[PDB]
Amino acid sequence: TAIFSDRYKGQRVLGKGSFGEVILCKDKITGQECAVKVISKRQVKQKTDKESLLREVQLLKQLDHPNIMKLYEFFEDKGYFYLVGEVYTGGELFDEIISRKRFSEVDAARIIRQVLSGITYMHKNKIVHRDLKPENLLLESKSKDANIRIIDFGLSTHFEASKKMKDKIGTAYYIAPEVLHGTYDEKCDVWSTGVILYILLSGCPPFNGANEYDILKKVEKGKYTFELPQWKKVSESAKDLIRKMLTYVPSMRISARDALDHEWIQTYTKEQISVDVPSLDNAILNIRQFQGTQKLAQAALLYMGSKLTSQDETKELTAIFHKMDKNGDGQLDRAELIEGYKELMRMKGQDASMLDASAVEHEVDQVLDAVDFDKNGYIEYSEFVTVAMDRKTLLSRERLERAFRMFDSDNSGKISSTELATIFGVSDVDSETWKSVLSEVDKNNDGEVDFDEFQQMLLKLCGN
Numbered sequence: 119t120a121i122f123s124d125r126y127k128g129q130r131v132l133g134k135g136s137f138g139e140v141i142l143c144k145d146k147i148t149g150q151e152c153a154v155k156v157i158s159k160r161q162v163k164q165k166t167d168k169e170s171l172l173r174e175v176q177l178l179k180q181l182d183h184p185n186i187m188k189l190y191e192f193f194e195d196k197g198y199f200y201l202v203g204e205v206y207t208g209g210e211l212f213d214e215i216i217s218r219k220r221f222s223e224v225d226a227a228r229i230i231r232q233v234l235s236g237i238t239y240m241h242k243n244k245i246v247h248r249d250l251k252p253e254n255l256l257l258e259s260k261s262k263d264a265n266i267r268i269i270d271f272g273l274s275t276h277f278e279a280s281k282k283m284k285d286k287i288g289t290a291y292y293i294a295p296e297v298l299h300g301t302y303d304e305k306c307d308v309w310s311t312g313v314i315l316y317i318l319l320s321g322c323p324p325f326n327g328a329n330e331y332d333i334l335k336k337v338e339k340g341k342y343t344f345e346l347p348q349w350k351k352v353s354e355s356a357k358d359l360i361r362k363m364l365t366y367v368p369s370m371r372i373s374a375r376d377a378l379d380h381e382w383i384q385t386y387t388k389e390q391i392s393v394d395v396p397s398l399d400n401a402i403l404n405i406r407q408f409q410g411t412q413k414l415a416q417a418a419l420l421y422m423g424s425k426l427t428s429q430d431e432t433k434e435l436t437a438i439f440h441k442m443d444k445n446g447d448g449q450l451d452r453a454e455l456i457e458g459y460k461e462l463m464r465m466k467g468q469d470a471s472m473l474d475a476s477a478v479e480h481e482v483d484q485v486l487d488a489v490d491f492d493k494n495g496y497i498e499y500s501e502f503v504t505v506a507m508d509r510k511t512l513l514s515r516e517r518l519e520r521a522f523r524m525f526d527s528d529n530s531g532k533i534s535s536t537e538l539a540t541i542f543g544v545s546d547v548d549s550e551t552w553k554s555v556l557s558e559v560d561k562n563n564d565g566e567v568d569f570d571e572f573q574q575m576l577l578k579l580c581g582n
């Protein structure tokens with residue numbers, strides 16, 4: 119058996135995805151950079167057996183298509199699976215799209231043709247995505263012309279998805295109805311793609327609602343409409359493909375492969391025949407609203423999660439250090455700080471960035487250097503822990519402020535309670551619950567909160 123960390127060193131965290139963290143890693147010999155998805159066996163249950171997982175992995179490694187993330191290597195130890203793939207630096211598609219000021223059916227067809235091309239290839243090889251959504255569409259690089267790379271093709275079959283809301287934000291919009299009821303095949307990926315297309319041309323989800331369950335209720339009925347004013351600007355051809363992708367009964371839904379031949383794809387992907395190319399201004403602005411909303415809700419939930427973790431870890435670390443403190447003087451040396459922090463990781467295991475003893479030593483060293491000025495031998499375990507725990511908080515609180523600022527597009531400094539409803543509905547915090555909380559933060563408020571007030575609301579919503 120091969121050991122992951124004998125071959126790769128963790129450089130930095132790329133983000134948090136379905137089933138676990140993705141870490142930028144580097145081969146310790148060749149220097150090749152890779153994006154490693156680390157799946158915690160304790161947080162993510164397997165659906166299949168080891169036989170079946172290894173076969174899929176072995177197949178996946180052999181597949182090559184320009185629109186599918188390349189898998190290079192697969193590792194397993196006691197506590198995790200490590201999926202090693204190519205790293206892409208262009209970010210999520212929609213985050214790129216909202217940075218444009220011009221966006222047309224030609225742009226959308228370029229995009230969707232890639233997606234369908236990737237899907238078609240994977241379906242030929244009898245791999246289904248099932249959880250296809252905009253997060254799973256990355257851009258190869260930061261270029262304008264960058265190819266799309268679909269991530270996470272095949273994992274859904276072998277791993278059971280988190281039931282935590284922080285992990286399933288914006289899943290409901292894209293799931294095919296047959297997935298909800300249990301009998302599904304590869305046509306579910308066409309539906310998901312159709313939802314994404316609808317969004318690209320209108321900037322609104324076709325199936326929408328105030329909370330996760332209302333969205334699902336709409337999905338399951340399967341009814342949607344084109345009566346939004348911004349569809350008047352959209353080709354009939356595009357709407358036709360949409361209807362075919364959003365066909366309820368899977369045996370009647372267009373295949374990925376056939377979707378590629380559809381008139382709309384054939385017409386709007388000719389690099390030069392731009393016969394009518396208006397820019398879909400309303401759509402792009404709806405998408406920017408949509409995206410900012412999703413990202414703020416996500417950030418709020420991870421903020422609350424981080425605050426709950428730091429309660430847990432602070433107490434556990436203190437108890438570990440306390441017991442290591444044989445003097446009772448409240449001081450410890452470096453090796454002991456490292457040992458307890460490893461003992462913490464021994465227990466916690468939510469920290470894929472600490473892939474070996476070498477990662478731990480350096481985090482501890484970041485903190486001991488950060489202890490401002492240094493006396494060597496006898497260190498006040500109390501303050502360490504304060505600062506060691508106070509990293510992650512602000513790191514996930516920075517993102518909160520960033521996301522608040524990004525959502526507040528008119529730079530008003532505040533969020534209206536209408537907007538709060540939308541954000542909390544998306545985050546699935548019950549309506550009565552968040553208003554009670556508001557009322558306690560600012561007893562005088564007039565239907566809007568600034569960043570600090572919003573933050574105070576979140577703290578109350580995670581039991582502080």
Ligand SMILES: CC(C)(O)Cn1nc(-c2ccc3cc(OC4CC4)ccc3c2)c2c(N)ncnc21
Pocket residue numbers: 132133134135136139140153154155187188189201202203204205206207269270271272273
């Ligand atoms: C927010 C994040 C962390 O998920 C962003 N992210 N996530 C990934 C990513 C996402 C899923 C992966 C899955 C893997 O297993 C293969 C797909 C089946 C291997 C690497 C994977 C890498 C990523 C990447 N390759 N390059 C740049 N950013 C990436």
